[PDB]
Amino acid sequence: KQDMPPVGGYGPIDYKRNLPRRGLSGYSMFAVGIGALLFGYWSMMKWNRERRRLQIEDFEARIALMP
Amino acid sequence: AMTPFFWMFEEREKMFEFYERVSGARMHAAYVRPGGVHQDLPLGLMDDIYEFS
């Protein structure tokens, strides 16, 4: 008279299938990308242009000597 | 692919446990007979299949 099945206490667990979490898609991407990339080239032309100014100063000390 | 082999067999060893508790042995159990099951399964296995499944 000592046998298994309980009178109660059950679930069940699902048979389902779901993890579609979105996700920042669909014109949200391709907009943060271009907005990041244009910040890069804007951070250029303030350094590459400025290094071009110090470049001429480096040639300047050459030319003021050599006679 | 390396991991889903390892990711499932680590979980699979919760289920070769269940053969040993009922028949006596690890994989090849001589349990089913031509007149039904050999012997009764112990007090348990319904609070342990249920936690597993």
Q: Quote the CA–CA distance of B45 and B10 in Å, as a whole number.
A: 20
The β-bridge partners of B34 are B36
For residues B2 and B29, give the distance between their C-alpha atoms in angstroms, rounded to a whole number: 30
Is the CB of B49 inside 8 Å of chain A's CB atoms?
Answer: no
Cα dihedral B23→B24→B25→B31 (10° resolution): -30
Asked whether the beta carbons of residue B41 and residue A4 sit closer than 8 angstroms, the reply is yes
User: Residue A13 in contact with residue B52, Cβ under 8 Å?
Assistant: no
Separation of alpha carbons A8 and B51, rounded Å: 14
**How far, in Å, CA of B17 to CA of B39, rounded?**
18
> In this complex, is the C-beta atom of B42 within 8 Å of any C-beta atom belonging to chain A?
no
Burial A41-60, CB ≥16 within 10 A → b, else e: eeeeeeeeeeeeeeeeeeee
Tell me which chain B residues have a C-beta less than 8 angstroms from the C-beta of A15. none
CB B50 within 8 A of CB B19: no
Q: How far is CA B37 from the centre of its chain?
A: 15
Across the interface, do B46 and A6 touch by the CB < 8 Å criterion? yes
Q: Method of determination?
A: cryo-EM
For tokens 């050599």, the residue is: A66
Q: Which residues of B touch A5 (CB under 8 A)?
A: 46
3-state secondary structure (DSSP) of residue A63 = helix
Chain B: closest CA distance from residue A52 (Å)? 51
CB-based contact, B46 to chain A, within 8 Å: yes
Going from the C-alpha of B14 to that of each of A28, B8, B9, B31, B41, the distances in angstroms are: 44, 10, 9, 20, 17
- Tell me the one-letter amino acid at A52: R
Q: How far apart are CA A63 and CA A57, in angstroms?
A: 10
Alpha-carbon separation of residue B23 from A42, A45, A46, B37 (angstroms) = 74, 78, 78, 10
